[PDB]
């Protein structure tokens, strides 16, 4: 009965989707699919973050328009996400008419309300190319150790940190020309004006404890005005009444999520939902799934921007940690920097979805993809615990009972134990305690396989006159499978479809209350195959 708008952070246009992105999008998709299973109105929204100096320069180097480049990158991203069955209701772009109009609108309102300030700043400028240079586009000699060709505000040889203005014999990364300091008028958003409001939100208890603690650190350091303008040349939205000035990509980026929803409503011919979800008096819920590196933008700048422009603010922020492979940050040299597209050439989407889900919690701690454990866990849990319940029992039903399940449950008590667990498992999905949900589900799977072993169908099947017993035992196992697959439906989309085809029924959350009796099931190839380390080794080699 709830109206929920859920978003995932917008992937940067100039970068292929990797395992890190997948952790975020999979976490959100699992939650979204569960919400849909409970009958709520859900709108899963995302978009490609396509503006900025890096993108502008990349396009120039490739000899194509930025529009063409971001378009191709967007399609690549969507192909990968579709491959992992991320169920977005809309995937738009921050470079859109919807975002242009909403960004101009919000800026206008913020300015009218007195939250925009003008101040001149001094910044390194490339006089040859004719453009201001972001820190990483300035290279030179470290002022401390004198090591050459160091980029931005830090030296990769001695570890020193400094302003790029301290680099010796500075050079433009773009043209090689010597940059010089140049003045420029910039527009600033008065974030400090929203300090009390933001502090109240931080202590409200809605945000994750770890996030609230980090925010207190930021309040202690002190909030500062935010530089939201960038000079031409730039690829983005030009600021109204300010020729040659553009909105910094980070200002328009989150607005792009609002833009993606407007685009969805407009395509649907829905003239009421946008305001119903974004107006101050909205009763709809708004959630953002994000990573630790952008919490400052989404927890401070964003809510303040919305408040200052008369829009509702996030109901909550769901933050996840970094992804590690084999315990460490992804390493290109070790072949652990894995792209989503590469992953799919070696394994299916469900395997990664399951593994991440089994490790995820409501905290922001890092998630580790240990490849050896990946093979062991997928084979042990999916193939040997869950799918086993169907694969060990379906054959007998199809070959000896014409594919028809027993007329009654052989062990009603055991079945109730399984259906009684729906409350706790659903609450775990709801609270984002994915690890807890999976542990509860696998505990049930253990009891199910214990039941089959206690009945020993491989023994019953060879004994004279025990046909009824065999059908009863195998049908019972298949019904336990039905329940487990329902609980795992948000996690394993493809296996679920194969399971529903086998069971001749769509799996619904409430449906488990009525077991399948005197019901016809269909035969199947292999619901899920084992994986091995040879495949992992191939994945790693292909990623080097």
As measured in angstroms, the least distance from the Cβ of 160 to Zn ion is: 5
**What are 527's strand-pairing partners?**
none
As measured in angstroms, the least distance from the Cβ of 147 to Zn ion is: 5
468 lies in the binding site for Zn ion (CB under 5 A): no
Minimum CB distance to Zn ion smaller for 147 or for 431: 147
As measured in angstroms, the least distance from the Cβ of 141 to Zn ion is: 8
As measured in angstroms, the least distance from the Cβ of 161 to Zn ion is: 10
As measured in angstroms, the least distance from the Cβ of 331 to Zn ion is: 24
Minimum CB distance to Zn ion smaller for 160 or for 344: 160
**Distance set, CA 259 to CA 71, 74, 240, 349, 392 (Å):** 17, 16, 18, 29, 50
Minimum CB distance to Zn ion smaller for 90 or for 165: 165
Q: To 5 degrees, how large is the angle CA 272–CA 274–CA 279?
A: 100
Q: Is 8 annotated as a binding residue?
A: no
As measured in angstroms, the least distance from the Cβ of 386 to Zn ion is: 54
**Distance set, CA 453 to CA 81, 409, 450 (Å):** 40, 17, 5
Tokens representing residue 520 in the block: 């016809």
Touching Zn ion, residues 40-69 (CB under 5 A) = none
Radius of gyration from C-alpha coordinates of the chain:
27
Burial class (CB in 10 A: 0-12, 13-18, 19+), 225: middle
Touching Zn ion, residues 362-421 (CB under 5 A) = none
Contact string 104-143 vs Zn ion (x = CB under 5 A) = --------------------------------------x-
Q: Is 474 annotated as a binding residue?
A: no
Q: Is 46 annotated as a binding residue?
A: no
Cβ–Cβ < 8 Å for 74, 36: no
**What are 168's strand-pairing partners?**
141
Minimum CB distance to Zn ion smaller for 149 or for 372: 149
Nearest to 230 by CA among 218, 239, 221, 219: 239
Minimum CB distance to Zn ion smaller for 150 or for 324: 150
Contact string 196-225 vs Zn ion (x = CB under 5 A) = ------------------------------
Contacts of 87 (CB under 8 A, 6+ apart): 29, 32, 33, 44, 493
Q: How many CB atoms lie within 10 A of CB 335?
A: 17
Concatenate the DSSP letters of all residues of 199-229 into one string.
HHHHTTS-S-HHHHHHHHHHHHH----EE-E
Which residue, chain included where needed, has tokens 């615990």?
Answer: 385
Tokens representing residue 312 in the block: 């509702």
Q: Is 155 annotated as a binding residue?
A: yes
As measured in angstroms, the least distance from the Cβ of 146 to Zn ion is: 7
Touching Zn ion, residues 69-98 (CB under 5 A) = none
Contact string 138-177 vs Zn ion (x = CB under 5 A) = ----x-xx-x-------x-xx-x-----------------
> What are the start-end ranges of the E strands in 365-459?
367-369
Count of chain residues binding Zn ion (CB under 5 A): 8
As measured in angstroms, the least distance from the Cβ of 183 to Zn ion is: 29
Q: Is 158 annotated as a binding residue?
A: yes
Q: Which residues are annotated as a binding site for ATP?
A: 332
Q: Which residues are annotated as a binding site for Zn(2+)?
A: 142, 145, 155, 158
Q: Which residues are annotated as a binding site?
A: 142, 145, 155, 158, 332
Binding site for Zn ion (CB under 5 A): 142, 144-145, 147, 155, 157-158, 160
């Amino acid at each position: 009965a709830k109206k929920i708008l859920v978003t995932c952070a917008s992937p940067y246009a100039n970068g292929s989707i990797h395992l890190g992105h997948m952790l975020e999008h999979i976490q959100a998709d699992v939650w979204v699919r569960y919400q849909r299973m409970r009958g709520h109105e859900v709108n899963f929204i995302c978009a490609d973050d396509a503006h900025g100096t890096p993108i502008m320069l990349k396009a120039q180097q490739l000899g194509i328009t930025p529009e063409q480049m971001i378009g191709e990158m967007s399609q690549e991203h969507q192909t990968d996400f579709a491959g992992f069955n991320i169920s977005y209701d809309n995937y738009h772009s921050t470079h859109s008419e919807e975002n242009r109009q909403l960004s101009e609108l919000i800026y206008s309102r913020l300015k009218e309300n007195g939250f925009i300030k003008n101040r001149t700043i001094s910044q390194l400028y490339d006089p040859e190319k004719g453009m201001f240079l972001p820190d990483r586009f300035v290279k030179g000699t470290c002022p401390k150790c004198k090591s050459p060709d160091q980029y931005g505000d830090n030296c990769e040889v001695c570890g020193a940190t400094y302003s790029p203005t301290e680099l010796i014999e500075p050079k433009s990364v773009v043209s090689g020309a010597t940059p010089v300091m140049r003045d420029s008028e910039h527009f600033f958003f008065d974030l400090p004006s929203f300090s009390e409001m933001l502090q109240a939100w931080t202590r409200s208890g809605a945000l994750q404890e770890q996030v609230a603690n980090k925010m207190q650190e930021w309040f202690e350091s002190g909030l500062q005005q935010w530089d939201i303008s960038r000079d031409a040349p730039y690829f983005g939205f030009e600021i109204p009444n300010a020729p040659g000035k553009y909105f910094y990509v980070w200002l328009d980026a989150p607005i792009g999520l609002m833009g993606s929803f407007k685009n969805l409503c407009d395509k649907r011919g829905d003239s009421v939902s946008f305001d119903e979800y974004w107006k101050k008096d909205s009763t709809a819920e708004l959630y953002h799934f994000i990573g630790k590196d952008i919490v400052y933008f989404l927890s401070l700048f964003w809510p303040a921007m919305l408040e200052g422009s008369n829009f509702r603010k996030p109901s909550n922020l769901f933050v996840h940690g970094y992804v590690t492979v084999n315990g460490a940050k992804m390493s290109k040299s070790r072949g652990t920097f894995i792209k989503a597209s590469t992953w799919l050439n070696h394994f299916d989407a469900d395997s990664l979805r399951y593994y991440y889900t089994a490790k995820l919690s409501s905290r922001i701690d890092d998630i580790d993809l240990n490849l050896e454990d990946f093979v062991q866990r997928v084979n042990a849990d999916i193939v040997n615990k869950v799918v086993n319940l169907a694969s060990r029992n379906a054959g007998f039903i199809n070959k000896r009972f014409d594919g028809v399940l027993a007329s009654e449950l052989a062990d009603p008590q055991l079945y109730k134990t399984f259906t009684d667990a729906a409350e706790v498992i659903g609450e775990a999905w709801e609270s984002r305690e994915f690890g807890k949900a999976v542990r509860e589900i696998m505990a049930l799977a253990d009891l199910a396989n214990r039941y089959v072993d206690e009945q020993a169908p491989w023994v019953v099947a060879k004994q004279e006159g025990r046909d009824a017993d065999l059908q009863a035992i195998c049908s019972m196992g298949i019904n336990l499978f039905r329940v487990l697959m329902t609980y795992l439906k948000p996690v394993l989309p493809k296996l679920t479809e194969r399971a529903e085809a086998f069971l001749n029924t769509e799996l619904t959350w409430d449906g488990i209350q009525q077991p399948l009796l005197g019901h016809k099931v269909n035969p199947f190839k292999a619901l899920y195959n084992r994986i091995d380390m040879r495949q992992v080794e191939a994945l790693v080699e292909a990623s080097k």
